């Protein structure tokens with residue numbers, strides 16, 4: 557039977573947070589024994605899914621790089637199913653998948669407003685989980701397409717509910733977190749509250765958990781629309797509210813989703829995934 561000590565060695569990275577107050581491991585490079593987990597999960601014959609949306613210019617700009625890198629780095633050695641949601645299945649880039657990789661494409665209705673595109677994913681992912689994903693995989697990861705796998709992103713990231721530490725704020729005090737601060741929004745998080753600021757670019761867990769994550773976030777999104785308000789960082793603001801109320805069983809270090817435009821600090825030892833485009837933190 558799998559024990560935490562069978563694969564997690566937090567002491568290997570003493571200068572960073574390797575475990576939360578609620579005892580969820582924060583996985584950093586050097587703290588995991590992937591070999592042990594690979595053998596463990598292989599024996600259970602697990603399958604992992606990955607949902608990614610590419611609507612509009614995003615298809616030509618990031619879909620191919622995202623998939624080609626995913627093919628090479630995502631859960632290597634384990635069955636993986638890529639669920640690709642596009643608005644125009646014709647612009648689809650054509651790539652060869654390697655061993656244990658396969659895919660399923662779905663044509664979706666494109667939202668006109670980009671923020672809507674980002675948020676509607678919560679709705680779409682949920683529908684698909686109920687319709688088929690719950691029957692196809694043991695774990696599911698939902699990701700932004702505007703990123704690229706730089707190295708192995710494996711089973712060490714698997715968990716019941718998994719969150720990603722946001723690259724910009726992983727060392728910040730919660731009061732500096734860009735949580736939704738208006739009480740009128742369902743994503744509202746009071747100053748003086750919060751554990752971490754999670755990035756909406758990557759989140760996952762078992763289909764059941766992801767279903768709950770997406771259903772709750774989408775309901776918050778809908779509520780805000782009827783209350784004439786929209787969370788500062790849309791689905792990400794709601795995701796942070798959700799993870800605050802429902803603590804994740806695993807958190808991935810910013811090494812699993814790094815922003816090269818803020819450089820490469822000492823704590824980032826081996827990037828597994830990186831943002832594709834430079835993004836500002838404007839307030840004025």
Ligand SMILES: O=c1ccn([C@@H]2O[C@H](COP(=O)(O)OP(=O)(O)O)[C@@H](O)[C@H]2O)c(=O)[nH]1
Nearest residue numbers: 609610611612614670673674700701702835
């Ligand atoms: O026009 C759009 C806007 C968003 N997206 C999807 O929604 C995700 C979230 O949007 P975005 O990445 O642009 O947010 P950011 O990381 O820049 O804050 C993207 O990664 C895409 O998968 C898309 O396909 N087309």
Ligand SMILES: [Mn+2]
Nearest residue numbers: 700701702757
């Ligand atoms: Mn993004």
